[PDB]
Amino acid sequence: NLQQPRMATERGNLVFLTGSAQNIEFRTGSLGKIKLNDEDLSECLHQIQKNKEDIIELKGSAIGLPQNISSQIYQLNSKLVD
Amino acid sequence: NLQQPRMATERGNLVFLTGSAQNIEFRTGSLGKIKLNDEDLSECLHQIQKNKEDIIELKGSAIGLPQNISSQIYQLNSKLVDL
Amino acid sequence: QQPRMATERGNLVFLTGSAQNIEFRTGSLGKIKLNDEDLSECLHQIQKNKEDIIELKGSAIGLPQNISSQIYQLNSKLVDLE
Amino acid sequence: VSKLWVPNTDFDVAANWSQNRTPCAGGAVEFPADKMVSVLVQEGHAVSDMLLPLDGELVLASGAGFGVSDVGSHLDCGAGEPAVFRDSDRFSWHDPHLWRSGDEAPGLFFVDAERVPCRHDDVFFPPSASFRVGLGPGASPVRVRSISALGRTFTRDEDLAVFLASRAGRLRFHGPGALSVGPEDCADPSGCVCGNAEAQPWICAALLQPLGGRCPQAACHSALRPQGQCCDLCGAVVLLTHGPAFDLERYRARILDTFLGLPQYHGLQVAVSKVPRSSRLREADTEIQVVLVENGPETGGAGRLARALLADVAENGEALGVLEATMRESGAHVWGSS
């Protein structure tokens, strides 16, 4: 009752298909790379993590504080004009 | 043949070649995953979208900052001196 | 050491040798789709996030020494006035 | 003495597809879902749809490729009833015609029980092709000297059991029979028995499986059934009582080079090996069995060569190491329906 993995032509495109809970994995040796037009995918996907960490730093800087520096200054400009 | 989507080998390497204006597509089931060596695709895409949304709010906050902030601090203490 | 398209319990694994690569190559308008997601669009979005973060850091430079402490001279003199 | 595996699970081999129909450009392909198999691909194939095995692998050698189905030179293959891969469990280790011997020579043949690997044989599965072999039910543990596969040569049972249990081994070896290796050499100049006497019922069942398991009758009265042969044949059998000086390899070359090269012995085939001195069910002794077969419409060439072998023993038996030499022969050739 397991669905067979399938390779088919579909609207002129080469298509690979697996079943309900079956994976499609790309696995190279310890010294191999996965590339899309000479660009290493592992370095692009690692950039997701670097982007995640830099956003954490930026969230802790003057930008990000869930009440902005603009908000606080707005409050005292408010109270002193008042 | 050689101009349309195909999968071939090249000195031990596995090569997927789409050609012009055609695709090579990999689809899994509702509960399947796609693995790029040790990386999970859906897990990567979720973090990309989260990074994108966080950048949007950080960008809007940086633009919303006044360009006067340092002048505003001296402004605030020239009135505290007045007080 | 030859490339193979291996299956286990319906899972599809494109397996490559120790020092071999899995290389996606596209032509003009050609696309690689992973569960209906354009792989090239995802790599560009990572790059755009990388560049938007670089500029956000530049806009974080030039901000006051650290406004966090200058927050507790606001309310310090609010308490004075009251 | 090397035994080589003949069949394969290659993609680009018409016999491996259901009723010998190889997939055509732009057509559908189906591997049976539950069949575990490793398939070697070496050529390009335009495919409209291909169902892969649930557990298996397509190996992509140099030249291998899978492309989409166009319509230009695809119209032929069209919508014509997918190519299905034949049962890849159909190859039996005990099938004599699935093995090729490295000792094969003109005028020489081997009895059926000695066509499958013997105890002191080196087994080779050619890496140039993917394969799958089954060790049949019962089929007391096959034990050979070494097994070569995937570029490795297994001489220790510890290494072999590791590989056979691994996924690479289970893609290629199946069945309840046990497989083992032992690096011993024969070292007896008079030869060694093949050791497949207990497995002969399974060897003959595999050989006769295309014929419903029944031997076809030989075209002669009083047909002979030599030791290790499954069915009756027409010809002669010479039994030598070997002395401690008998050189089985030299004596076999003597028949091939001295006798078969003679004009009166043209078109004859010989089988020389040490066999048990008995089909006795209980641990019997050994003999040198020479099987002489004449193919074609000839005289008693087999009986004449058999007598020339006894005469050569009566003249040079001491120097050849033969103590005694007997013979028996089949009867008259039948020309009708047996």
Author numbering:
A (entry chain D): 38 to 119
B (entry chain C): 38 to 120
C (entry chain B): 40 to 121
D (entry chain A): 20 to 357
Q: What does the paper behind this entry write?
A:
The intestinal uptake of B12 is a complex process that requires binding to the carrier protein ‘intrinsic factor’ (IF) and uptake of IF-B12 by the intestinal cubam receptor. Cubilin has been suggested to form trimers, which are anchored to the apical membrane via interaction with the type-1 transmembrane protein amnionless (AMN). AMN is formed by an extracellular domain, a transmembrane helix and a short cytoplasmic domain harbouring two adaptor protein-2-binding signals (Phe-X-Asn-Pro-X-Phe) for ligand-independent internalisation in clathrin-coated pits. As cubilin and AMN depend on each other for proper processing and translocation to the apical membrane, disrupted interaction of the two proteins leads to retention of both in the endoplasmic reticulum (ER).
For structural analysis, the ectodomain of AMN (20–357) and an N-terminal fragment of cubilin (26–135) were co-expressed in Escherichia coli. Crystals of the AMN(20–357)–cubilin(26–135) complex were obtained and the structure determined to 2.3 Å resolution by the single anomalous diffraction method. Electron density is observed for the entire ectodomain of AMN and for cubilin residues 37–120. The structure reveals a receptor architecture, where three cubilin chains combine into an intertwined β-helical structure that docks on to a corresponding β-helix domain in AMN. AMN forms a bean-shaped structure protruding ~60 Å from the plasma membrane and is composed of four structural entities. The fold of the two N-terminal domains of AMN (denoted β-helix 1 and β-helix 2) is similar and is formed by right-handed β-helices with hydrophobic cores. The head is formed by a three-turn intertwined β-helix, which irreversibly interlocks three cubilin chains. In the C-terminal region three cubilin chains form a coiled-coil, which is interrupted midway owing to the presence of a proline residue (Pro103). The cubilin interface with AMN is formed by the N-terminal strands of three cubilin chains (residues 42–49), which combine into a triangular face with a hydrophobic centre formed by Met44.
